[PDB]
Design a protein around this ligand. Structure first.
Ligand code: CL
Length: 461
């Protein structure tokens, strides 16, 4: 029995690479064994063991998805550049996963700083809160998909409180005012994501149907801070797969590190079976792509594009989209990146869950990732692609007011039917009729005080 890289080259017979591959193969077998000895449905355990025997003893050739030149380049990038991560807080660990957007196949990964010194696989084993990288999946993507907001929809960021009366905070700030979806995402403000998930619940939206299609296990959906990543912990590999679904215009493919297991007699025993699912519509996923493009361009929450410009100005011109997250004590940082072909997930942190430095996600993980991305391209010059993410033909563009995010028109501004007028903007929608006409409660969220204040500077013009 052996494991090969995608090209057929021998990995080994029966060091993260070996362990991660054998584990998956054994899981393959086990699922099957629950029907070879005919068989059916805490033992278990017998079958887990049975599987590891049947694998080590058989004369099986297991073919991985692992691209060999890419995977070793990624090993060399972490050896060469992991020191970029160090910030005077102890050993900063790292996990990464590179995934094919069309297939769900994993091409390479970083399991940690150095397997010799520390064996924890940070790509496939360790689970951490995804923090604000939860928002495009769980809040905004689904609200767009249910036809409840469009690209230029306005949301509340005015101060507001949880049900216990504690304030919703963003670092030391308590909120500001009305803002577009662009601005909410670029800065990653929390209160507008609070109100979006809260509106999804008021409408009875099946949020869990969406998350379980991308393979997400969340034990409790009834949690106010859920869209900021509370009550959620994920592996890097499972997280890259929610970003694969958005990059790939809304169609999930399941991650996998094995395509083919073959007998000693060359018969095809096991084959990866593709089960594509349209999680979000095409309108939705292509709208969210255009938003996440701006997250990386505006450079508010990450320096990644500047880093990549200076290392490889030609790769910096590829069509990068992405999103960041910080857990609320600086303990874990995330940076998720896609071109149309690939998606690289990244996590940093400490095994013992304690703070990182203040600019560890902003600057440190961003600069490391940008060295990682360039290393990947140096070893496979056309893998990232030159393609562009592009709005779907089904997208509905509406012409809306900047100030409201809805169509211009008449509104009763505290009784006194006003004529609402001013500069307009195109707004992309994933429904049938686009954006409504302006009503008085024009944002997602807000208290009457907020709208008194809102409306009386809109009126003032
Ligand atoms: Cl910058």
């Amino acid at each position: 029995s052996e494991i090969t890289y995608s090209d057929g080259t021998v990995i080994a017979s029966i060091d993260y690479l070996y362990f991660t591959t054998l584990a998956e193969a054994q899981e393959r077998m086990y699922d099957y064994l629950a029907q070879r000895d005919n068989v059916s449905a805490a033992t278990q355990k017998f079958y887990r063991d049975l599987a590891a025997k049947e694998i080590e003893n058989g004369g099986y050739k297991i073919t991985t998805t692992i691209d060999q030149k890419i995977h070793s380049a990624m090993q060399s990038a972490v050896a060469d550049y992991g020191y970029l991560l160090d910030d005077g807080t102890g050993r900063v660990e790292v996990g990464n996963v590179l995934m094919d957007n069309q297939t769900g196949a994993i091409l390479g990964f970083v399991g940690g700083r150095n397997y010799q010194e520390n064996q924890n696989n940070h790509a496939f084993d360790t689970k951490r809160s995804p923090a604000s990288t939860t928002k495009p999946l769980l809040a905004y993507g689904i609200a767009i998909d249910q036809g409840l907001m469009g690209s230029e929809t306005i949301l509340s960021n005015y101060p507001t409180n949880f049900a216990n009366g504690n304030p919703i905070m963003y670092a030391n700030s308590k909120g500001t005012g009305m803002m577009t979806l662009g601005e909410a995402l670029n800065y990653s403000w929390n209160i507008p994501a609070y109100w979006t998930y809260r509106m999804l619940r008021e409408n009875g939206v099946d949020v869990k149907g969406y998350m379980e299609k991308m393979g997400y296990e969340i034990p409790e959906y009834g949690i106010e801070s859920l869209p900021m990543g509370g009550g959620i912990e994920v592996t890097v590999a499972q997280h890259t797969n929610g970003y694969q679904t958005l990059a790939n215009n809304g169609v999930y493919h399941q991650k996998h590190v094995i395509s083919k297991i073959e007998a000693a007699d060359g018969r095809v025993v096991y084959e990866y079976q593709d089960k594509p699912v349209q999680v979000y519509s095409k309108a939705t996923a292509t709208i969210m792509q255009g938003l996440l493009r701006e997250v990386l361009s505006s450079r508010v929450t990450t320096t990644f594009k500047s880093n990549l410009t200076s290392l490889n100005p030609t790769l910096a011109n590829a069509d990068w989209i992405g999103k960041t997250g910080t857990t609320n004590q600086d303990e874990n940082m995330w940076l998720m990146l896609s071109t149309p072909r690939l998606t690289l997930g990244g996590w940093i942190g400490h095994d013992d869950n304690h703070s990182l430095s203040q600019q560890a996600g902003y600057s440190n993980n961003s600069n490391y990732m940008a060295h990682l991305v360039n290393a990947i391209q140096q070893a496979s010059p056309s893998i990232w692609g030159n393609e562009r993410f592009a709005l779907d033909p089904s997208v509905v563009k509406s012409e809306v007011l900047k100030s409201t995010g809805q169509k211009p028109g008449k509104v009763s501004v505290e009784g006194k039917e006003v004529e609402v007028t001013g500069s307009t903007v195109t707004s992309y929608w994933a429904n049938k009729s686009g954006a409504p006409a302006t009503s008085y409660r024009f944002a997602i969220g807000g208290s009457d005080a907020d709208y008194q204040n809102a409306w009386s500077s809109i009126v003032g013009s």
